[PDB]
């Protein structure tokens, strides 16, 4: 199927530079113009510019000209966008989109790349089990004080998916994140069933497993 897959979320210090990638598959990468559009948290879509994947020519909205640089590698059907001298205000989700050979809109969009501009340092999470207090019970896991996003939580190495609610992380005042995962389970299961929340924070190379037992 026609598809655009963007590189993973990145974090950078103010004044640094980031380069984001956009991998296309399922069509002739050199036939359509590639666009980049930004969406800062809570904001509308903002067109940044286009690149001709075939020739390399670029055209920029006035707001983005100069400190945004679009390139491409025909080899791996990958487009690149670079932001220079980053500012805290540049924290946003960045999308590449296919459009124009004769323009019929942007029919294919990548999943978006999050670029966060911050001075905090990579920090692995401390993980804490939230023991349960009847018909159902709520047992959980606390993923505390980590940077950056994201972390992944599964239960019992993936065997447990029903009743799992993993909440969006909070960005504390400290600069660090925290997030909780809770699973609803039958009260007859406690003391009988093992509950383990698998936490993975790739940026700090941290994998942790915690047994969550009744009090």
């Amino acid at each position: 199927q026609v598809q655009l897959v963007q590189s993973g979320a990145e974090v950078k210090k103010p004044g640094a530079s980031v380069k984001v990638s956009c991998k296309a598959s399922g069509y002739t990468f050199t036939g359509y113009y590639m666009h980049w559009v930004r969406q800062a948290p809570g904001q509308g879509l903002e067109w940044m510019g286009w690149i001709n994947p075939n020739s390399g020519g670029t055209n920029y909205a006035q707001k983005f000209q100069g400190w945004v640089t679009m390139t491409r590698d025909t080899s791996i059907s990958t487009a690149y966008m670079e932001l220079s001298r980053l500012r805290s205000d540049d924290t946003a989700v960045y999308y590449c989109a296919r459009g124009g050979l004769y323009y019929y809109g942007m029919d294919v969009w990548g999943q978006g790349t999050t670029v966060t501009v911050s001075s905090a340092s990579t920090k692995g999470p401390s993980v804490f089990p939230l023991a349960p207090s009847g018909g159902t019970a709520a047992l959980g896991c606390l993923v505390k004080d980590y940077f950056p996003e994201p972390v992944t939580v599964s239960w019992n190495s993936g065997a447990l998916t029903s009743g799992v609610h993993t909440f969006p992380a909070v960005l504390q005042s400290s600069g660090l994140y925290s997030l909780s995962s809770v699973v609803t389970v039958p009260s007859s299961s406690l003391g009988t069933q093992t509950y383990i929340c698998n936490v993975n924070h790739k940026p700090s190379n941290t994998k942790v497993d915690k047994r969550v037992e009744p009090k």
Binding site: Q111, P168, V170
Partner: protein, 210 residues
């Protein structure tokens, strides 16, 4: 010369017809595209070249474009049509792509849901580690506005409170969470702490004790 205007919001009863406009100088001679964006997903092209639908977009979505106003029209509105909608043109006289400012579409009439509150106390493991976190989990509420207040022995606490802004769940209701931070002595010094959640004039409280 190059500004696209949309109403910032439109709201509509279910089953009714919604209409979202896109204003522009001679836009009727330009070629207008529309995008639908639901929360946390990437925009989707729903209408292109004024009025064509890409495959997979149902006919309830139609489009029009004449004079200085283009119109996206959504027939037989469902709650699943709630989203932001952007219009867009390529401006030939500048080779720029321009988006409209976006329209919030609200489908009125979904029913109220009080939040479920779950509250966890610090664990012994956190305490031995100088953390102690109170965790308040708030789920399944509609609509998505809420105030969270922490109490320590009936007295308000504002220090050490971190709260998320509400987010839509998969079931199209909302979630949010609040964390309180305190020292082990602060935790051990009171009879109780409370996570107090108010939603649509009603308050739901959960309380925990050492």
């Amino acid at each position: 010369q190059s500004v696209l205007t949309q109403p910032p919001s439109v709201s509509v009863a279910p089953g009714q017809t919604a209409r979202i406009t896109c204003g522009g100088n001679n836009i009727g001679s330009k070629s207008v595209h529309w995008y639908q964006q639901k929360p946390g997903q990437a925009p989707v092209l729903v209408v292109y070249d004024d009025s064509d639908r890409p495959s997979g977009i149902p006919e309830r979505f139609s489009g029009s474009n004449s004079g200085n106003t283009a119109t996206l029209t959504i027939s037989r509105v469902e709650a699943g049509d709630e989203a932001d909608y952007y219009c867009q043109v390529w401006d030939s006289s500048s080779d720029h792509v321009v988006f409209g400012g976006g329209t919030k579409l609200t489908v009125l009439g979904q029913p109220k849901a009080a939040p479920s509150v779950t509250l966890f106390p610090p664990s012994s493991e956190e305490l031995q580690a100088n953390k102690a976190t109170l965790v308040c989990l708030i789920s399944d509420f509609y609509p998505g506005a809420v105030t969270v207040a922490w109490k320590a022995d009936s007295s308000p606490v504002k220090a050490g409170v971190e709260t998320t802004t509400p987010s839509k769940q998969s079931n199209n209701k909302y979630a949010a969470s609040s964390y309180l931070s305190l020292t082990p002595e602060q935790w051990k010094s009171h009879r109780s702490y409370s996570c107090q959640v108010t939603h649509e004039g009603s308050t739901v409280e959960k309380t925990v004790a050492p």
